[PDB]
Subunit: 152 residues, 6 copies
């Protein structure tokens, strides 16, 4: 897919509550990525248990699911070259204490449980997460007039 | 409704294309308003013709509808005291040439046909537009921890 | 006093709680005014009752005093030409609904009771307020290297 | 000329010294205007005396000319619909004390002699000033990919 | 102390003179740390010689003390989990040439002697510096309504 | 030359088209570097072939030259201690995928061909590039009043 690669990002409840949705979106916009889906949702525990299926054996799993179900999240899909890996780099390490200044977590967060945002960790994860959170008809193709200035 | 008043805002295609979605959202966030719904959509001509029903006899109606249907828009609902009138003030006059610096249109736009954003013009318009664009289950009630610092 | 005019500003508890101290300070810094005093304090009811002596007959007086005593404020003195009147303009109208975008209240606030900041309303008020909140030895004289580029 | 209208702007020495060149340029860029010329120069007294010929009888003329010749200025030409009048609005009133917050002078200046920037006051003034400061071969025609999103 | 850990920061004279006090405070605010003390002061040589006691053998010690005593500084205490180590990371390396973009020194400074800010290098250093610069009654306890969104 | 070291930077056509000229200039301004030359130009292929002489055997050379000649660039000279190496660090790695957040390319770009800006790679390169792009009389000496706060 190359430049058509996509990732799933979600602003977590702490990001909404601390009024950082615009700030986060703006960082992906200024980087050059293309927004292809967006909605504010209250995720069910059922969806979240599937979202985090791979973490089912971790001791924080129960609390992570409860937390993510506790308030609104902003679900998003972004498109562009290497968007999965690059998004992860813009977000910064899982634990904000390891995330350098300049990253979202490095600039805005302190603790692993309140780290503002989720990003898919691979192309395959993004495929799964996009399908889980969004119908095909919520993913928009639009002609991106900036593309000429971001890509050869 | 008082502090529960709501308005409908939409970032128009020019706002998406020029990468101002985050910028716009951030201005409503920093003002203190509560985001209660959000989605990126491709609006149909049918929806837009009803959205702009009051302008049906004006000669720009056709091209307004075509333009708004020509690319993705970011549909939003914001909640708070006097949110309809205050949102209109943050956005600025219809014609950007009359919108002072500090407003969205005053800072970011030049011409009336490319003026970035729609806001409801009254509480009754907001009522109609919210129902037209969003189901009840897309409008989220969340406990706003900032509310104590915005309201008495 | 001319360019030596001074005003008293205070970031109110809502400004501290919403993390807008730096934002506010930065607006006075970028304007060209000279910071001559600064401290984070918890104001007593006794001080606040005198600070707001002129409002003693108003129905919001009791609640205003209690609120301002309820949490830390950032007390400040700024110096420069016409600083009292210009600070009031940067802050915006008492009621944020009347404060245009570009002002502190217009950009960041909604309601008259949670309006972020106090500014002296006149040179006489500033005289009184500066004396009430700060000792002479908390007001600092420093050689301002920017002064040649702000003043003729 | 319509959307091909042009104005002459100059960041004055105080704007260079206070490091606000980027800030100012960014405000015209975000507004949608097209940059068609730009250079850092040290203007001669001869040029400045002609630039300000209409102010020759005013008491500040001598000091204005000397000051503008005392350091580098950033000379610019911007193009777009109503750019002369709109530029003046973004800049704000001559005397910064009358320039509201949101404008360049309202946000960044205090005194009439140190007011950061010059803008042409009319289409005829811009014609004269552009010719005086720039050769025809310093004014660049480029295909503006944003134009589709700023104009009908 | 965990989340009650505290560090001492000081904006040095160059930070005040270049008008970066707001900018610096804003970076600590947006990170989530809690401001518990703040004042603008002119530090004595006596205090500064003790502040920098560990550097007494170094060749820049005399000049460092003189410089820090030469103009106002903004003394601060910040509270939060791992605040001492994280503050140092937000500030960046001692020598700004080694401080990456995104850090305060990486974004705003060039030279080791003009590096904007001091931060305690350990919990014990912070304890000592807090006691040296502030009385107990200048350190404020306030109920932090954002804490729920920064900490588990 | 020490603090008199100079580098050549150029905002490439993508930086002009995406409206990031002010943003880029502002980063060099806030760092403390001194702007000593600036112009918007349309570079000839002849000049660009010499500019990029060392890359003549690389497969992108033809397309790089054509691209850089295809639209306006903003040519600049900046002065200060270690400005060549530090500029390169602020810009970030050639390939934006390797450029961390906080850098220009890390924040604003995706692909190596659309990476916003050129910076000299050494003191000798800067010497050559400055002479190639600018006459001696376009390089300005001005007294930098901020220098006392950037340098010891
Ligand atoms: N030790 C922990 N305690 C609490 N929450 C944790 C912990 N480790 C991870 N989490 C949370 O779970 C989320 C998912 O964990 P994981 O998938 O391993 O990391 P990532 O989100 O970086 O892919 C994290 O982003 C974080 O909010
Ligand atoms: N003369 C015009 N030509 C083109 N578009 C127009 C014209 N007048 C208004 N419009 C467009 O129609 C939209 C709706 O018009 P109106 O409802 O009167 O204004 P507003 O959006 O400020 O409530 C405007 O926001 C603008 O984009
Ligand atoms: N009607 C009101 N209800 C609640 N609080 C009010 C009301 N009017 C004023 N206040 C509060 O009292 C403060 C002081 O009032 P006043 O001195 O008249 O205004 P200002 O602060 O603009 O000088 C206001 O800034 C506001 O926070
Ligand atoms: N009384 C004054 N003292 C000092 N400088 C002044 C005075 N009046 C005007 N100036 C300066 O002269 C410039 C040109 O004056 P004028 O052309 O009337 O204003 P404008 O710049 O708004 O077109 C102003 O921008 C200001 O910098
Ligand atoms: N070689 C030097 N020349 C001048 N000043 C220096 C030098 N090295 C360090 N300093 C200054 O002394 C301060 C204290 O030194 P040190 O305690 O090592 O650094 P830090 O502030 O990073 O803990 C530095 O922040 C810097 O301003
Ligand atoms: N593989 C490539 N494909 C396309 N363009 C490239 C490639 N490698 C380099 N370039 C472009 O050519 C410019 C010059 O390359 P080079 O001089 O090696 O890098 P730098 O700009 O870091 O000094 C780069 O900045 C980039 O825009
Ligand atoms: Mg994960
Ligand atoms: Mg309307
Ligand atoms: Mg009052
Ligand atoms: Mg004039
Ligand atoms: Mg130290
Ligand atoms: Mg190179």
């Amino acid at each position: 897919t190359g430049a058509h690669e996509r990732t799933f990002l979600a602003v977590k409840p702490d990001g909404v509550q601390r009024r950082l949705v615009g700030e986060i979106v703006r960082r992906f916009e200024r980087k050059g990525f293309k927004l292809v889906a967006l909605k504010l949702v209250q995720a069910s525990e059922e969806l979240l248990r599937e979202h985090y299926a791979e973490l089912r054996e971790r001791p924080f799993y129960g609390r992570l699911v409860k937390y993510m179900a506790s308030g609104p999240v902003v679900a998003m899909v972004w498109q562009g070259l290497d968007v999965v890996r690059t998004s992860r780099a813009l977000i910064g390490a899982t634990n904000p204490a390891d995330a350098p200044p300049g990253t979202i977590r490095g600039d805005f967060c302190i603790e692993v449980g309140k780290n503002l945002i989720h990003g898919s960790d691979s192309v395959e994860s993004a495929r799964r997460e996009i399908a889980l959170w969004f119908r095909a008809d919520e993913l928009l193709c639009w002609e991106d007039s900036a593309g000429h200035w971001l890509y050869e």
